[PDB]
Enzyme design. Sequence first.
Site, PDB file in Angstrom:
ATOM      1  N   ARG A  35       0.817  -1.209   0.000  1.00  0.00           N
ATOM      2  CA  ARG A  35       0.000   0.000   0.000  1.00  0.00           C
ATOM      3  C   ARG A  35       0.853   1.262   0.000  1.00  0.00           C
ATOM      4  NH1 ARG A  35      -5.222  -0.995   0.321  1.00  0.00           N
ATOM      5  NH2 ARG A  35      -5.979  -2.937   1.278  1.00  0.00           N
ATOM      6  N   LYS A 192     -21.684 -16.787   1.990  1.00  0.00           N
ATOM      7  CA  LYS A 192     -23.132 -16.626   2.061  1.00  0.00           C
ATOM      8  C   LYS A 192     -23.642 -15.758   0.921  1.00  0.00           C
ATOM      9  CE  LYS A 192     -24.180 -17.332   6.955  1.00  0.00           C
ATOM     10  NZ  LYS A 192     -24.634 -16.680   8.213  1.00  0.00           N
ATOM     11  N   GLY A 340      -9.699  -9.362  -0.487  1.00  0.00           N
ATOM     12  CA  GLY A 340      -8.483  -9.880   0.117  1.00  0.00           C
ATOM     13  C   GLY A 340      -8.225 -11.333  -0.231  1.00  0.00           C
ATOM     14  N   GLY A 363     -13.726  -3.558   0.806  1.00  0.00           N
ATOM     15  CA  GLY A 363     -15.137  -3.268   1.003  1.00  0.00           C
ATOM     16  C   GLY A 363     -15.644  -2.171   0.087  1.00  0.00           C
TER      17      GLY A 363
END
Length: 386
Positions: A35, A192, A340, A363
Site C-alpha cells: 500500500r 453466504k 483480500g 469493502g
Amino acid sequence: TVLKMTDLDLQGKRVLIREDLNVPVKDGVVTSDARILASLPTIKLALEKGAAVMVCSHLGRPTEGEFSAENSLKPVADYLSKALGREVPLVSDYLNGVDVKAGDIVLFENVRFNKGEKKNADELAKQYAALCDVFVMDAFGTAHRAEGSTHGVAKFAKVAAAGPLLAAELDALGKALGAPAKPMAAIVAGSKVSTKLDVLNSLSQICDLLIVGGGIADTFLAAAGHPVGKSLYEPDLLDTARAIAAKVNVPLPTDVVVAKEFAESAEATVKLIADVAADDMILDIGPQTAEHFAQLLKTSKTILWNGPVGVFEFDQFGNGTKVLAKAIADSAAFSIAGGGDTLAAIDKYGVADQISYISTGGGAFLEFVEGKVLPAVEVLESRAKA
C-alpha cells in the site's frame, strides 16, 4: 467528474493528501509495503509539483481520543524516510497548526486518533481544511465511509481533488461496470449469498456469465436440487438464487472435490455433484468443472474476479482456483480483481502482472460493484462544479 491533482497548480501550496497507509506492522516495523509503494507516485508527484506536502492516513482501529503506540504511523514515517531518501517527520500534534515549507513533507499521526474522525464531525473536518490549500483524496479503500479525513475535509477545503491512485481505481472500475466489453464474465465467491446479495444482483444484470464459488455456490447448487452434504447454504435464499440464475447464466459445477474432515488420514476425493454424501464437505470445484469454467472464461472481453473457488490455502483444494487464475491470466480480457481472498490467490499462483487491474479497495470495491454511492467520491463531485 472530479478534479484531478495532476491538473492543479501546486507550486508553493500546502497540500493534504489522504493516503491508504494502513499496512501490517509488527513491533514497530512495516512488514508488507504494497500500500505504501502504491501511494509513493502520488507523494513524489506532489513534491515534484512544488507543494508543501502533508500526508495523512488511518492505521488499525484504535480507540478515538486515546493514543495507542501500536496504532502509531511512526513505522510508516521510518519507511517513507528510507523510500524518499530524506527525513519524513511524524507530526503528532497538528490540528492547531503545522509548519511545513514548500518542498518539505510530513506524515500526520493516525487520523483515527482524532475525536470526531469516525463520525465525520464538522469541527474536525474544518481543522483539517484549515491546514491546507488543497485536499487530495487518494485512498479508495476508505472511500465508502464518510470520515473526517475522507469526506468532511473535502466539504471545507478551498480545493478538493482526487489523487492519481483514486482516479486510476475509478477508471478501471468504470471500464468493467459501465458498458463493459461483451461478453463479460464475473467470478463471485463467499460464504453466504445474503452477505453478497447486492453484489450478485448488480452483476446479474451487467455480466453475461456468472461463476459462483464457495458457500455461494452451495446455495446455487442446492437451488437446482443438488446435494451439497455438510456444506453451508442458506435455505431462506434458494428462491433468490433461482431468480439470479433466471436473469444470468450461472453454470453449475460438474464435479467437486470433497473430504470428510481435515486430518492426516483424510483423502480428498473428486465426485460428481449427484454423488456427494451427507458427511461430505465441498471444498473445491472438480477438475472437469475447472476445465469447463476455464474454457468459458477464455473468450471473455471483460472479467470481474471476486473470490477463489475453493479452500485454496490447502493444495488439495486449490486446483480449481489455480486453473481459473491461469485462465484469467491467459485470457485477453480486461481483468479486474478485488477482495483480500482474491489478492491472496493472485499472489500464491503468481498471475499479478497478467491481471489488468488489481483493486486493493476491499469493502469499497464491493460497494462500487453494488452500484452504491461512495461518499468520498460524492463530495469530490460536489467540489468539481463551476
